[PDB]
RNA sequence: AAAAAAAAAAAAAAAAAAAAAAAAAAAAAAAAAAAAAAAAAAAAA
């Protein structure tokens, strides 16, 4: 099939179609360029000052990102945090035995010239400062990324978090529109700050100010949905990462799995940079994204859904994937895991179930090959019970959002 | 399966995935550091005073936790309480024979410098003091932890409790939001106080002021839900702790059970510190929590639910657990316990049911097992091609149909959907 | 014609006025457009649902 | 009389799409919208 030809007149034709570039970009394969995550923050000038440029700047539609940036640098040099262990990543040392370090031993710079208010926007603001203001500011990263009454859900609670040994009201005017400060997202250095705040308090989980991760948290594995629906599939099938992996039954799902699992990227690593590849700008097209792993994302979720997952219910149904092979392979894996439970006596009193005491009855366990065999044995077309299993998984599901694998499954199966 | 490889091009791949730290932390394995539960209470200055700093501080959005803390220390030195028995825990002596002791023989300190009002908030408040004000204050720990019209339920009654023998009325303004004083929770020393008040009155259950446990009670086994749904499963299957244990049929449920049952932690102990591991800060990630025991929590409740438990109805359905093996193993245990009751003559008059009659019969086959032995049932289940039977799934659908008012994301709502249709 | 080409002019044949009747259009490829979408639709396509 | 898509200028074609996205998932701790104790027919001269 490298070479197609029309039959009646017997002329060639080259079916070609619009290319589709943007390769992925891995964390590691970027520290092969630079060894530092440059955080340009400019006005290393007064903090007492900057604290004001932002309190006032926020109670109105205009506060410069460049200012909030610099404000955060100011509030966040709680050089607190004693590395009880070591800490490196991708070559980058960060601190060895017990070394005392702060949120920014992740390589600071300083940039350009333009900055708004003069000397003092107002003397009002005391150091009811770090206490919350940064929290609140970082928390707007989280709010900015969203779109439905979750925005007001997210703000309204990402605003009872500054009522924590503070007390207060709530600032800035317009609800949302992904517009009011949803631009901070677009700011290379802002993202770098939240990414650092999280990566830091992620490490020093017990810190007093660790409460700050409230908004800074949606940064960890930002754009790594498929990576995370992998881990969820595993957890929801109770199966091991490797055994789940064998259950991948489509070239372009395995292609993506291969792309995700690429080594020396610190995926699995305790406290690595990788989770923040996107916000630290180590990558501008993450290889763990739903969108670069559409087939994997669909399958893994559809499967988990069938296996009673609450999450998957609402996972988006990626477009331009082969739906009618991904679902089949999902159904099967779901069926396998589903029908044939994992029951096994765990405790006893000298007495336990030594277990080694029909035609076409589904396979004993969860071996891919046992099941593939069984399926081929099924003329390669999903069986009545399994399709019933599927219809039992999805009927009774209500409140399904359009274009989710949830709504997909229910339509594919309940009728 | 340590080593996976792609087939067509035959290259390796290492399926790895984001790690997941926060280990648990046990009570015991903390007194291997310190032998004291340090209650930093700073302003050991006047009480008549502090009683005011809080009465007024509360009738308004601003009262310092540091103040309530110190106020409680003041009101709660009812050094009352005669240890009729002994009393130790984790090495810590607390009082031997006849020893007379009070709520704070649990190791007090004193801290920093900042404190709000000057000399006198207002001379108003008499010693209509301990009588309730502490109760009320402690009661707000309980209220703070919550989220639905239970808040107003909980306050509205955790406020007819100060109308007791004292008859003194309701206070601050805003309903809730987990915000108004729901921050006292975050206070290391506050929690330590309520934890001590409970642990104490828990011991001296008959004390006059024991009425104080009203709010201080949600502290005992705070973050130990799986531990408690274990006990409930037991109670609800009438089975013994050990026989219930054998009925655990999933690696990760047993792993959790093992983690829970870890010895020398005083779980089972009369009046131990363990129940308060969280609030005394003996632990910052309790090993008895629903969340560190997700599979155990699910199973145990789902099962209990099936066995008619009223509680389980509303237990949350933990995420990222294997739902379709936990339910199977739950259904099975439920079925076992359910179908085959526990009937046996208990009393008589010289005449009783000798039960071993020549047990030869007709249902010569596949009828579910006589009793509740795991192995008898496992066998039977394997005998069932390892797929839950019609009656047992009917038993399940009888358990859950007719259940109404099920909350979303509870094992209740789960079971009804899994079974009623 | 550089259809498949990375960054070619072809995608803009219309707007660059390189063409005033594009050979890739639904309208000059009515049968192909129908078939391909109808098919895709059957194969669960979300897009095709709304193709004219 | 003349007519006959309440067709149509073309060009057109997802009431698709900036990029990045992807549970309208999440500080963490939790987890019966259980629970002072005592009780518990919203039973009773």
UniProtKB/Swiss-Prot annotation, chain B:
Keywords: Capsid protein, Helical capsid protein, Host cytoplasm, Ribonucleoprotein, RNA-binding, Viral nucleoprotein, Viral RNA replication, Virion. It comes from the Viruses. Residues 349-389 are annotated as: Interaction with the phosphoprotein. SUPFAM superfamilies: Rhabdovirus nucleoprotein-like. GO terms for molecular function: RNA binding. RNA binds at residues 142, 151, 205, 213, 285, 316, 407. Its main location: virion. GO terms for cellular component: helical viral capsid; host cell cytoplasm; ribonucleoprotein complex; viral nucleocapsid. It is found in: Virion; Host cytoplasm. The keyword rRNA-binding does not apply. InterPro entries: Rhabdo_ncapsid (IPR000448), Rhabdovirus_ncapsid_C (IPR023331), Rhabdovirus_ncapsid_N (IPR023330), Rhabdovirus_nucleoprotein-like (IPR035961). GO terms for biological process: RNA replication; viral transcription. Encapsidates the genome in a ratio of one N per nine ribonucleotides, protecting it from nucleases. The encapsidated genomic RNA is termed the NC and serves as template for transcription and replication. The nucleocapsid is bullet-shaped with the tip containing 8 turns of a conical spiral before reaching the helical cylindrical trunk. Nucleocapsid assembly is concomitant with replication, therefore viral replication depends on the intracellular concentration of free N, termed N(0). All replicative products are resistant to nucleases. Homomultimerizes to form the nucleocapsid. Binds to viral genomic RNA; this interaction contributes to the virion assembly. N in the nucleocapsid interacts (via C-terminus) with the P protein (via C-terminus); this interaction allows to package the L polymerase in the virion and positions the polymerase on the template, since P acts as a bridge between N and L. N(0) interacts with the P protein; this interaction prevents the uncontrolled aggregation of N(0). Interacts with the matrix protein (inner layer); this interaction contributes to the virion assembly. Interacts with the L polymerase. Belongs to the vesiculovirus nucleocapsid protein family. This is Nucleoprotein. The gene is N.
